[PDB]
Amino acid sequence: PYYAFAEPFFIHAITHLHVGSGSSVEEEIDLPFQRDELGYPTIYASSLKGAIKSFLLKEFPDKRDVIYKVLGEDENPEEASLGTFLDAILFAIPSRIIEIDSAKPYVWVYVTTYELLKKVKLYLDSISQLSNASFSNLKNKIDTILAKEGKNITLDSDLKSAILNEDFYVELEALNNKIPSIINAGVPLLVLEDSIGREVINRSLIRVRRIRIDRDKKVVETGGLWSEEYVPMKTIFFSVLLGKESKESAIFASCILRNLRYVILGGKETIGKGIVELRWVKDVI
Amino acid sequence: PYYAFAEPFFIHAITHLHVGSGSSVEEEIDLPFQRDELGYPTIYASSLKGAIKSFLLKEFPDKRDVIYKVLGEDENPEEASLGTFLDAILFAIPSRIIEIDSAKPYVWVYVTTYELLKKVKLYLDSISQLSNASFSNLKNKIDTILAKEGKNITLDSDLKSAILNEDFYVELEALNNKIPSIINAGVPLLVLEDSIGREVINRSLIRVRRIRIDRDKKVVETGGLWSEEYVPMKTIFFSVLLGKESKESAIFASCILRNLRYVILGGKETIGKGIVELRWVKDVI
Amino acid sequence: STQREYVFIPITNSITIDVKITIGGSDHITNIDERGIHNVLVITGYAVDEKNGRLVPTLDPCDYVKGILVAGTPQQAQSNDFLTLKLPANKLYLIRKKGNISDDLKIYIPYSSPDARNSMKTKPVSISDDTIVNNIIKEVFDKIYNITQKEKVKIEKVKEDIKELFSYYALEQ
Amino acid sequence: STQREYVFIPITNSITIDVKITIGGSDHITNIDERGIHNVLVITGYAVDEKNGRLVPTLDPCDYVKGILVAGTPQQAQSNDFLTLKLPANKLYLIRKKGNISDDLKIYIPYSSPDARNSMKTKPVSISDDTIVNNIIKEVFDKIYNITQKEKVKIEKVKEDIKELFSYYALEQ
Amino acid sequence: STQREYVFIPITNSITIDVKITIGGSDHITNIDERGIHNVLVITGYAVDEKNGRLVPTLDPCDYVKGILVAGTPQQAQSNDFLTLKLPANKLYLIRKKGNISDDLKIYIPYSSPDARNSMKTKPVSISDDTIVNNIIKEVFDKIYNITQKEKVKIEKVKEDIKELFSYYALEQ
Amino acid sequence: AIDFLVNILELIKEKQCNINLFSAISLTSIVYNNFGEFLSNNQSYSTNNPLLKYHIIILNDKNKTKDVEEKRNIFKREVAELISRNFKLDGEKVRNYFDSLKEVLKSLKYTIVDVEITTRTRALIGVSTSLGKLIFGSGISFDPYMNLPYIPASEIKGIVRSYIEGKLGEQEAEEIFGNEEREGNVNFTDAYPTRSKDFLFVPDVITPHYNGKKSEADAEPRPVIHLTIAPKVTFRFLIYYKREDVGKPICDSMPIILIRGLGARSSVGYSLFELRKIEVIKAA
Amino acid sequence: LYEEDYKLALEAFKKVFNALTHYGAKQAFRSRARDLVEEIYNSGFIPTFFYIISKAELNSDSLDSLISLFSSDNAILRGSDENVSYSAYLFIILYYLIKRGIIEQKFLIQALRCEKTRLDLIDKLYNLAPIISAKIRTYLLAIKRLSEALIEAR
Amino acid sequence: YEEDYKLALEAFKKVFNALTHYGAKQAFRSRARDLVEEIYNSGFIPTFFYIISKAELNSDSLDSLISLFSSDNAILRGSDENVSYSAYLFIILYYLIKRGIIEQKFLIQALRCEKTRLDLIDKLYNLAPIISAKIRTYLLAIKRLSEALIEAR
Amino acid sequence: LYEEDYKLALEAFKKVFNALTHYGAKQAFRSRARDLVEEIYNSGFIPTFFYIISKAELNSDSLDSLISLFSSDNAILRGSDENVSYSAYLFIILYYLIKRGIIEQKFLIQALRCEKTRLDLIDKLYNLAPIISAKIRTYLLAIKRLSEALIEAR
C-alpha cells in the first residue's frame, strides 16, 4: 500500500488529438506528435497532468485546495504533490483497412502490438504490487492475448487477411472468439507482431499541411506552409493515476475522479482538436 | 569476512528514470541525468540509499529500529550505519534495432559494452573478498564475455548485423556456444566495443523539452521552457547492498531484502518517473 | 508635434516651474496606469541644482537624473533655460517601456550652465522621509495627473516608486 | 552585343571614371531602379590597390573586388588599361540579380600588370566615411546615372548599399 | 630570391616541361613521398585552352587549374607570357597541405591574354586515359625530382593521384 | 497481393459507402499507373472485372502504345465515375457524431453554434491534399477514418477571421481569435457532410491551353480529370466558445462569408455555399 | 561497409545534381523532393513509387540514361523539365533500394525495362514493405534538405 | 580552455551587427538555443543539413557570409527565418575556419560558385565526429551570449 | 592582503539583501551564492560569467536598477525569482570590479547602458579573467557565508 489509490484509465480521443513534441531535426512533420522510446504515439504524463490539473482547477473551484494537494500547489511548490500520472501508452490506434472475404465490411480497424500490450501489463503488474488495487480481469484478458505473441492475431472478428494503410499486407490468425473485447466496442482489433505493427501504427497518424495567406495578395505567404500530426478519432491510450494516503487523496478519488469524464489535451484546441474522454478501468474493466 | 551479507542486484526501470545531477554551467541540458566517471548514466549510491531508506521506513513501519541500524539513524546519529550501497553501474540499456541480415525480427534489444562489464567484474571481485559470499555463476558469465573483447558479440541471438538507434551499424559475432541469458528475457543482449557503445548508449537516452503555461491566458510563461534527460524504461543498473554483522543485518537480509520488489528512485515522481524494480542476483539464476 | 519638457523629480519643492499646458490633448509619455510610473526618461551627466533646478550639464557618465516626461509650455514662452532638443524617440533612454513610443516629438529639458569658481562635486541623492514622498505627489503628480488618486486604490504602489525609481546626483554646492 | 565596362567601387576616387561614354544602346547592367543596386558583378582573385586602382591579379581566392558593369569603351582605343575578355554571361557572378542577361557580352575590366617587385600582402577594406559615399554618388552613381535619383524619390536608401555591398581588397601600400 | 614557376597537369603535351631548368636548389613546394602528391596548387578563374597550356583569366570562380608550382624561371627566354608574381605564400590556395611554407614566394604562371576573339565557354576536363597517366609522370613528374621513376615503388600512387587530384577546365577553342 | 489489386475495383461498386475510399483510391492508383502492364495477359478476372473492357475495346492499330495511353485516359474517367456514382454519402454516423460531440461540449459548459452549410456549386476543398493525387493530380480533404470529405476547422477559422479582420479591423480580430500572446476565444470543428440530394463526389475537368505559354505556338490543351464535391451537399460543423462577447460577430459574419468562396478556384465560381441553418445552444 | 542515410543521400544527390543540366530541371526536382516525401507517408510507399515511374514517362532513351547514371558519370537525364525531375527522384528511390540491399539491381532494372517482371516487382514491394517503410523516409528527408539548400527556390 | 569563449565573442559580435532588424535578432536567439541541443540529440550532420536548408543560400546570401568573414559592415538580407539560419551557419563556419578544421581558402571557394558546396558538405561529413566534439563549448557559449545580449520576443 | 574584502562583502550583501523584496528571491539568491562560487573555480570565471548573464536576462529596467544599486540604497530588483537572483549575483561580481579598480567604474556604468559597449565589457573581462578570479575568491567566499547565515527560511 505505497499508493493510497491506483486508478488506471483509458483515454479515448473524441476528436483528433495533437500533443506535440516540438520541432525536431530527424522529422519531416514540423509539428509532430509525442513519440515513445519505441516510436509509438505517447502522451507524456507532464502533458496529461498539465491538461487535467488546469481543467480540474476550473470545473471544481470549490475543491481548489484538494487539487493544490494531490496535483500540486502550482505557485510556490513548498511540498511534493501526492498524485502521480504515468505516461499514456498507446493501447489501440485506428488504422484504415481494405480487405476482401468478409460478410461485414470495415473502413477502419483498431490496431495494437505485443510490445504495446506488454507495457500495459507492466503497468498493471507494478501498480498492483505498489498498491492494493489488483485488476486481475484486465491482466487476464491481456495474458490470453500475449500468449499468441509472434503471430498477427484478430480479435472481435473473422478477417483472414487485409492490407493495412495501403502498404502492408498481413495474414491474420484468429484468436478464439471468446476472448472478450477490451475496447468494449463493435469494431474489431488486430494485434500485429511488433515488426509489422511499428510500420502500420506510425503511418496511421493523420498528417495535415496548413498554410498562411497573404492578406493582400490572397495567396500563400513565403514560408507559411507547415505540416502537423494528429492521432485519429477514437484512439485509445492507457495510463494510471496514482495517489498517496493523505486524507485528500481519499476525496480526490471519491469525488473528483468520479466527476471527470471529458478533458481537453494538447494543442490546436481552437481548430477542434484535443477533446478526449477518460474511461476508468475501475468501471469498464 | 568484512561484510556479513553481500547482496548484488539489478535495478530495472519500470518507467523512465531520472536521478538528477542538478543544473550546471557546462551541461547544455537544464536538468541532466547523473553521469558516470566515463560518461555513462549511473545512480549515485546516495540517491539509492536515500530513496530505498525512505521507502522501507513507510513500508515496514514496525522495523524502524532494524532499518535505522543498517541504514543509519536520522534524528541523532550516535554511530555509523551498518549497510552500504554501491553506485549503480549501468548494466544494459534498451536500444532500438534494425534487424538486417536476419529474418527473426526484434524491435528493440539490450545493449551493453565491455567497459560497463569490467566495472561489474570489479564490483564482484572486490565484494567476493570482503565477504564469504561468492558469485561464481555471475562472475563466470561475465568473464566468459570479457574473453571476447575487441569484438561486438551477441549472447542469446543469431543476428550477424544490426543498425542500432537508427545510425550505428554493428557486425555481431555470436558467442562461442551460448550464455544462459544473464538478464532473463526473450530480447537478446549485445556487447559492443565502447567506441560504438558510447554513441549508441547516448543516442538511447531520452531528452524532453517541457513548458509551463500561464494560469489564466493559456500561453507559455517567460523562459518557462526547459529540457530534461531520462533513462529509458527497461534499463538495467547493477549495484550491491553490503552489510556488517549486527543481529540486525541478519534480519535486514532475511526479512527486508526479500520483500523489496518495487521502489521509486529519482525525481519527477508526478510524471510517473522513477518506478523501478530490484531483482536480487541471489535469486536471478 | 507635442514638444516635451523634462520635469525632473528631486526632493526639492521648487518643481512647479509653470510648464503647465497639456499635450495638445493629454498625451503624456509618463503613465500612472495602476502599477506605478512608466516611460521614465534617464539622461547622464547632469545635476538637479537642488534649488529651482535646471539640470546643469556635467561630463560624468556616472551622474544621471531621472524624472517624468510631459509636454507643456517651456516656462510660458521663456526658453532661455532649456536645451531645444528634438529626437527620433528611439534615442530616448526610457526605462519601463509600457507601450511603444512615437518617431519624433520634441524635447525641452530644463537647462543651466556651469556656475564657475567652484567644481561640480556632485553627490548621489535618494528619496526618503515620506513627508517629501507626499510633497512630491502633492504638486508634480496630483495636479498634473488628476486622472486618478481620488478613485483608484493602488496609490501606495506608486507611492513607493517615488522612493524606489527616482534617485539622482544633486549639485549640493 | 554591348561593350560593357566594370567600374569597381573602392573608397578612393582612383576610379575617376577614366573610361568612355555610356551604353550606346539602352540598357546598363548595374541597375539602381527601385529595390536598390542590382546585378552587381564580383571578381575574385584580384585587389584594386587604389594607386590608380586597376585590379592587380592576385591568386588568393579570398581576395575579391565588387563593382558596377556599365556599357562603355576602354578609354579611346587605349586598350591596355583593361583586360578585354569576351564571355557568355553565364559565368557572370552577379549579386542582387534583377532580370535576364543575354548569351554574349563584352566586359572591359580596369587591369594592371602583375605588381611584382613586392609580395602582394593584400588586406581587406570596406567602404565607410560618408564623405566618400557622398563623393562616390556624384562621382559615378550620378555621372553615369544623371537620370535616376530624380525619377526615383528615395535615394539615401541605396547610399548605404555602397557601404554595405561594395567591399574589396587592396595591397595597402 | 626563391624563384618559382607554375607547371600543371593537363592532358596536353605543351606542358611537358614548358619551362627551362629548375632552380638547382633543393627547395620545392610539393612533396611526393608518402601519401602521393602533396601541396597541389589550385588557381581559380583560369582555363588551359586544350593546347599551349597557358591560363587565360576568366571571371567565374568555378574554373580550376590544379598543378604543381615548382621552383624556377620561365624558359630563360621572352618574358611575354608569364605572370611574374610575388606573394607571401599565405595567399596561394594549396590543397593537400604539408610542411608549412614560411617565406614570400615569387612565382611565374603560364598567363595568356584574355584573347577577346569570341566567347569563352569553359569545358571541365577530368583526367583519365591511363596511357597518358604514365606519360604525364614520364614527361613531368619523373624529371622535376628524379627521386621518382628511379627508386620509387610509390609510382603506383602517382598513377592514381593524377586521376584523383588534378581536374581543370579548358576553352577548347 | 497482385491478386488483391486486380479485384479492388469490384470492391468499390459492391460497397458504395463501406470500403475505405482513401485506401481504395490509393490501391487503384497502382493499377492506373501500371495500366499497360495490368493488360498484357493478366487473366483470371471475374465477370464483374472492369479490366476486360480494355482488352475487348480497341482504339488504335498502328501503335501498341498509343492504343494504351488512350485506354488509360478512359480508365481514369471511368474511375472518377465509379467513385462519384458508387461512393455516396451516408450521413447517419455524422449526425450521431455531431450530436454526441454537442452533448460533450454542453457537459464542458460551452455555448455551441451548430451550423449547416449547403454546397451550391461544385466545391473543391483541399485540392492540394492527397486523395486521387496519384490518379487525378488533385485531391479533396478526406478524413480516412470518417471515410468522408471534410472542410478543416483551420480553413473555416481562417476564412472567417479574414472577413472579420477585413471588416472589424485588426484589434477586434486579435481579440476574438488571439495572437502569439493571447489564446483565441473561438474554437471550430471540421465540417462533415450530413446529407446530399443524389451524389457526394462528381467528376470535373480543367483544360488549360494558355498557361505559362509564350505565344499561340506553344499552346495545347492539357485536360485534367478530377473529383469535386457535388452540389446540394450539406456540411455540418460546430463553433463553441465561452465568452458571450464573441457570440455576435460570428453569428453575424457566417451568412456573408459562405456566399463568397469557401475553397479552391472560387474566382471562377466553384466552391460557393449557402447557410442552411444556425442553432445556438447557450451554456447557462 | 555500410553508409548511413545521410551519406547515402549525399552520394545519390551529387549524381542527380550533376546529371540535371537545365536549372529549370533542378528547380522542378526541388519541388519533387519537397512534397514527394510527404506523399509517401499519406499514400504509402508502393502507390507513390509507381506514381513516380509513370510521371517519369520512362521512354526508351530516358530509361536508358537513368540506367547509365547508376554506373557512368557522363550520364545526363534528358527530357522535359517535369519528366526528368520525376526521373531523377526515381533514381533517388532506386539508389536506396539497391544500396541497402533491399532489392537486387538486376530485378529493378528488369522491372522498369520489361513489362512482365514489373508485376512481379509489385509483389516484392508488398513483402518488403515493412523493411522499406521503416528506413527510407529519413533518407528521403535528407534528400529534401539537400535540395532546399543546393537549389534556389521557385 | 577559454579560447573558444573568446572566439564565440568575435563571432557573436559579427552576427549581432549583421542582423539589422530586431526581430531577426530575436530569431537568432531562438536558433542559438534550439540548434545547440539538436546537435546533442540528433548529431552534427542531421542538424547541419537542417540548418543549411532553412538558410536558403543562393549566391546572394553566400556573398554576405563570405564578406562577413572579412568585413564588419556586411548585412544579412532576408526574413527572420532565413537570416537567423544563415547567421547560425556563419557561426559554425567561423569556428571551423578559426580552428583549422577547414582551410579558409577552400571554404570560401567552396561557398562561391556552383558545386564545391557538395564537396564541402562531403568533407564536413568526414570530419563530423571531430567537429561535434570541439564545438560543444563554443556553441554553448553562443547560446549564452544570445540569451544575454538579445532580449526575448 | 584581502582584509578589506570582508568589509566589502558586507556592504555589497546588505544592498542585495534589501533589493530582494520577495522572500523567494532571497532564497533564490542563497542558492546562487553557494553554487556560482563553486563553478568559478571549477569551470572558470568567464564560463560562469556567461552562464550568469544568460540567466540574468538583462536589457530592461533591471539593467538600470543595477546602475542605481551602485550608489542608491532604495533600488529594487524586479523580475523572475530566478532572474533577480542571478542578476543580484551579477551585481555582487560587478560591485567588486568597481570598488577594487579592476574595471573602471565609468566604463562599466556606461557599458551597462550602451548596448554596443556590453560586448566590450565581456571582452575586457576575458583578459582580466585570471586576475579577477584570484581576487574575488575571498570576497565571493564571504558572500557565500553571509548568504547561508543571513538568508533564512521563514
Decide: C9 and C67 in contact? Cβ < 8 Å.
yes
F134 vs G: CB within 8 A: yes
G150 vs H: CB within 8 A: yes
Q: Which residues contact A119 (CB under 8 A, 6 or more apart)?
A: A89, B233
* Residue listed under C-alpha cell 455531431: F98
Is the Cβ pair E62, H113 closer than 8 Å? yes
Decide: F172 and F164 in contact? Cβ < 8 Å.
yes
Q: Which three cell numbers stand for residue E8?
A: 600543371
Whether the CA torsion H91, H93, H97, H100 is positive or negative: it is positive
Residue B6 phi, psi (nearest 5): -130, 105
* Residue listed under C-alpha cell 485588426: F170
Amino acid occupying residue G132: I
- CB contact burial I67-98 (16+ within 10 A = b; e otherwise): bbbbbbebbbbbbbbbbbbbbbbbbbbbbbbb
Q: How far is it, in rounded angstroms, from Cα H93 to Cα H99?
A: 10
D107 beta partners: D4, D85
Neighbours of chain A (3+ CB pairs under 8 A): B, F, G, H
C21 vs I: CB within 8 A: no
Q: Which three cell numbers stand for residue F124?
A: 473543391
Helix (H) or strand (E) holding B190: strand B189-192
Closest CA–CA distance from residue H51 to any residue of chain G (Å)? 9
Edge-to-edge, what's the strand order for the sheet holding C4-8?
A: C67-71, C4-8, C107-108
What residue in C sits closest to I63 (Cα-Cα)? C95
**At least 3 CB pairs under 8 A between chains F and E:** no
Whether the CA torsion H72, H76, H80, H82 is positive or negative: it is negative
H38 vs A: CB within 8 A: yes
H115 vs E: CB within 8 A: yes
Chain B stretch 200-219, residues whose beta carbon is closer than 8 A to a beta carbon of chain A: 206, 208-210, 213, 215
Q: Could you give the 3-state DSSP secondary structure of residue G30?
A: helix
Closest CA–CA distance from residue B179 to any residue of chain A (Å)? 23
Q: How far is it, in rounded angstroms, from Cα A88 to Cα A238?
A: 5
Q: Which residues in chain B have their CB less than 8 angstroms from residue G134's CB?
A: 98
Resolution (A): 2.8
Q: Which residues in chain F have their CB less than 8 angstroms from residue G43's CB?
A: 26, 29, 130, 133-134
Distances (CA, A) of C162 to C66, C142, C145, C168: 11, 13, 14, 12
B10 beta partners: B238, B279
For residue I64, the domain's CATH number is 1.10.520.30
Nearest Cβ partner for H2 among I47, I51, I60:
I47
Burial of C132 (0-12, 13-18, 19+ CB in 10 A): middle
Closest CA–CA distance from residue B107 to any residue of chain G (Å)? 11
Closest CA–CA distance from residue A210 to any residue of chain F (Å)? 8
Q: Which residues contact G35 (CB under 8 A, 6 or more apart)?
A: none
Is the Cβ pair G134, A198 closer than 8 Å? yes
Closest CA to G14 of G110, G137, G149, G134: G149
Domain span including residue G68: 5-150
Q: Which residues in chain F have their CB less than 8 angstroms from residue A215's CB?
A: 162, 165
Amino acid occupying residue F114: D
Q: Which three cell numbers stand for residue H40?
A: 546533442
Cβ neighbours of F155 (radius 10 Å): 21
Q: Which residues in chain F have their CB less than 8 angstroms from residue G115's CB?
A: 36-37, 40
Q: Could you give the 3-state DSSP secondary structure of residue A174?
A: strand
Q: Which of A14, A16, A96 to mutate to test the interface with F (most CBs of F within 10 A)?
A: A96
Q: How far is it, in rounded angstroms, from Cα D126 to Cα D138?
A: 19
DSSP-derived pairing of the beta strands D64-71 and D3-7: antiparallel
Cβ neighbours of G108 (radius 10 Å): 20
Q: Which three cell numbers stand for residue F23?
A: 485506401
Is the Cβ pair G51, F134 closer than 8 Å? yes
Burial of A144 (0-12, 13-18, 19+ CB in 10 A): middle
Cβ neighbours of D136 (radius 10 Å): 23
Closest CA to H66 of H96, H98, H110: H110
Indicate the number of domains in chain I. 1
Q: Which residues in chain B have their CB less than 8 angstroms from residue I47's CB?
A: 25-26
Q: Which of E59, E92, E123, E169 to mutate to test the interface with D (most CBs of D within 10 A)?
A: E59
A108 vs F: CB within 8 A: yes
Q: How far is it, in rounded angstroms, from Cα D26 to Cα D2?
A: 9
Helix (H) or strand (E) holding A170: strand A168-171
Closest CA to F220 of F211, F232, F230, F229: F211
Burial of E17 (0-12, 13-18, 19+ CB in 10 A): middle
What residue in E sits closest to H112 (Cα-Cα)? E61
Nearest Cβ partner for I47 among B25, B222, B223:
B25
Is the Cβ pair H112, D95 closer than 8 Å? no
Decide: G91 and G13 in contact? Cβ < 8 Å.
no
Helix (H) or strand (E) holding F239: strand F233-241
G137 vs A: CB within 8 A: yes
Q: How far is it, in rounded angstroms, from Cα G69 to Cα A21?
A: 40
Which technique was the structure solved with, according to the deposited record?
A: cryo-EM
Q: How far is it, in rounded angstroms, from Cα H109 to Cα E61?
A: 7
- CB contact burial D81-113 (16+ within 10 A = b; e otherwise): bbbbbbbebebbbbbbeeeebeeebbbbbbbbe
Nearest Cβ partner for B25 among I48, I57, I83:
I48
I119 vs H: CB within 8 A: yes
Decide: H116 and H109 in contact? Cβ < 8 Å.
yes
Neighbours of chain G (3+ CB pairs under 8 A): A, B, F, H
Q: What is the CA radius of gyration of chain C?
A: 15
**At least 3 CB pairs under 8 A between chains I and F:** no
Q: Which residues in chain A have their CB less than 8 angstroms from residue B206's CB?
A: 37
Neighbours of chain F (3+ CB pairs under 8 A): A, B, G
